[PDB]
Amino acid sequence: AKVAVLGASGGIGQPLSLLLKNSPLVSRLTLYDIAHTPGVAADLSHIETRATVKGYLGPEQLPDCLKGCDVVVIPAGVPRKPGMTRDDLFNTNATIVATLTAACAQHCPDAMICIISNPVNSTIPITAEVFKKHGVYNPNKIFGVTTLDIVRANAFVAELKGLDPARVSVPVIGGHAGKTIIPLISQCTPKVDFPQDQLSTLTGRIQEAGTEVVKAKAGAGSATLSMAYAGARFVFSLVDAMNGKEGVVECSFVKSQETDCPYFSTPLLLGKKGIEKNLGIGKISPFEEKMIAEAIPELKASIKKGEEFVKNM
Amino acid sequence: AKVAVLGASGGIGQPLSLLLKNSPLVSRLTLYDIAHTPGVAADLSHIETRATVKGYLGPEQLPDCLKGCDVVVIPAGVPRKPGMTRDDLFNTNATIVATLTAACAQHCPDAMICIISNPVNSTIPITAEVFKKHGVYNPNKIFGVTTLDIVRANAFVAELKGLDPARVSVPVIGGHAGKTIIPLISQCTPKVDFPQDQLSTLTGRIQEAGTEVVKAKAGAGSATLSMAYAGARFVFSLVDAMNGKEGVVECSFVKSQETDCPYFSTPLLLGKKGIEKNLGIGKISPFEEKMIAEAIPELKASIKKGEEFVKNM
C-alpha cells in the first residue's frame, strides 16, 4: 500500500514511520513535516525493506506527498504537558488538522484518512467538515484512531488475569478523552470476571493511562512508542482488509448512527472501501450503560467545538 | 530472552526498545539511563506484547537492571554533529562505555554484550580490557555491532540492481569507520556484476553513509531509526542462535585472529554460547584484498587507542 505520514518528524511520527517502513504491506512511504523530514527520510531509506521512502518539507511540497496515497496517517500536533487536558490542545492543533486535511481532500480524496491529532473527539468532526466543505466527504473512509485504548485494555486485562496479551481482546467504545473512553469488559475475549471494586479500578486505569504517561514523562512528551505501535496496528489492519482479508474488525471514532452522538467509536468491520459494517454497541452490562449515558454530554460538547471551528475557519 | 538496554532514553535507545518490546523472542526488557527512563518504560509497558518492561534510573539502580540478563545492548553515547568525526566522540563515549561495561562484567558476566556506542573500533577494545580487568573476559560473547553496514549494503545493492532487498545479502568486513568498512561485493548473494567505476562509487556510498545521514539531519543527530532496526536484527539473530536455530550467521567486530589485526569484523556462525565458528574472509577479489591492506593500519590505531585508555583510566 502507499502510505503518507503527515507530521513525520514528531515524537509519534518517527517510530510510526519506522514500523511502517518495516512492513512488507507498505510499498511506498511518503513523509511530510515542516521541519527535519529530509533527515528522517535519509535515515529510514537505509532499511533493507521494500517500501520506497521519500521525505517532503513545507506546504508547497505537500501535494506531491499525497498523490496516489491509499492511506494517510496524521499524528501532527503538539503533545500535552503534565496538568493539561487534551482539550487544552484544541486551539493549537485544530489549525494543523484543518490545513493538512484540506490538502488530503484536494489531492487524495479517495484515501483512507487516519487522524491521531489530539483531541480526536473534536479533530475528526473538523476533518469531516473540511471534506464536506470540498464536497468530497465519505464517512466510511475517515478514522479517528483510538487503537491505543484497545491495546491498553488488552495489556492491562492480560496482566491482571495472568493471560497472554496476544490472546486478549476487549472492545473500547466512546471517544478518546477521560470518561468518554468506555472499555466493554463484559464483552472481553476471553470471559474475565472481576468484582466491581476491581472493575471500577481497571476502568479508571484505562481512562487515565495517557495522563499517567504524560505525568511519568514529566514534560518530555506523551505516549509516543505505544502510540506508534497502535497506529501501525490500525494501518496494517486497514491495508490487509483492503487486500481482501475478511473479518478484520477494529474500533474507531467514526461518523455514527449508533447513538444520539454524530461521531462515536464502536467495533467496525473493515473492507476494501473502508467500513464495510458498523458492528454497534452490542450487549452491554448496566454499568457499561451508565458510562455511555454520562459520556454523551462531553462528546456532544467536544464535537460541536470541532464543527463550529470549520463553520468560521 | 532477558534483554537490558543501557542508554534507553536516547535517539537509538527508544526505537530500539520499541522493536525489542514488540518481539516474541523477548520475555523481559530492562531499560537503563541516567534520565527519562521511567516515562519511556511507562509508555512501552502499555503495548500488548509479552515482554515485561522495567525502567532504571541512575547508577544506584544499574545492578538491578542487569541482574539475570541474557543479552545486554549498549546504545549509550553522544551523536555526531555535522563536521565532527567519529573519533571526536572518543573521549566522551569511551568513559560511558568503560563505566557500563564494568557494571556488566560484575553483574551479568555471562551475558552476550552488544556494543553499538561510537567508535566501535576503539569501544570494543575498551570493553575487552574492562572484562579482562575483572577476570571475566570471554571473547566469544562480546560483539561490536556493525549490522548497519550490512543493512545499508543490502539496500544499496538492491536498488542499484532493481532487486528485492529481502533477498540480497552482501558481506561487510573490517570495522565501522570510513576506509575500514570493507563491503565484499564479490561475495554478494546474488551475483550482481558491476562495472568497476560503479563498484568504486558503491563502496564509497557504503563507507560514508553515516556522515551523509548526519549531514542530512543538520544537527538533529545521526542514524537512529535504521540503527534501531539493525541493532534489533543483530539481537534477534543472537537470541535465535541461543535458542538453538541452526546456521545463524552474522558479521560482527569481534576479537579475531583472521588477520594480523586483533579485532576484525568478518562473518560469524553463532550458536548457543555466542560465536560458534569464525567464518573468516572467504574468497576475495584484488580490489577487496587491497581495501583490507589499506584498512589494517587505521584499525590497528583505533584498537590501541581503546586499549591504552583503560590501561590508565
Curated annotation (Swiss-Prot), chains A, B:
Post-translational modification: Acetylation is enhanced after treatment either with trichostin A (TCA) or with nicotinamide (NAM) with the appearance of tri- and tetraacetylations. Glucose also increases acetylation.
N6-succinyllysine: modified positions: K54, K67, K161, K179, K191, K215, K245, K272, K277, K283, K290, K300, K304, K311
Keywords: Acetylation, Glycoprotein, Mitochondrion, NAD, Oxidoreductase, Phosphoprotein, Transit peptide, Tricarboxylic acid cycle
One GO term (biological process): malate metabolic process
Catalytic activity: (S)-malate + NAD(+) = oxaloacetate + NADH + H(+)
Activity modulation notes: Enzyme activity is enhanced by acetylation.
Chain residues that bind NAD(+): G7, A8, S9, G10, G11, I12, G13, D33, N93, I116, S117, N118, M227
Localisation: Mitochondrion matrix
Glycosylation sites: S9
Subunit structure comment from the entry: Homodimer.
Protein name per its UniProtKB record: Malate dehydrogenase, mitochondrial
Name of the gene this protein is made from: MDH2
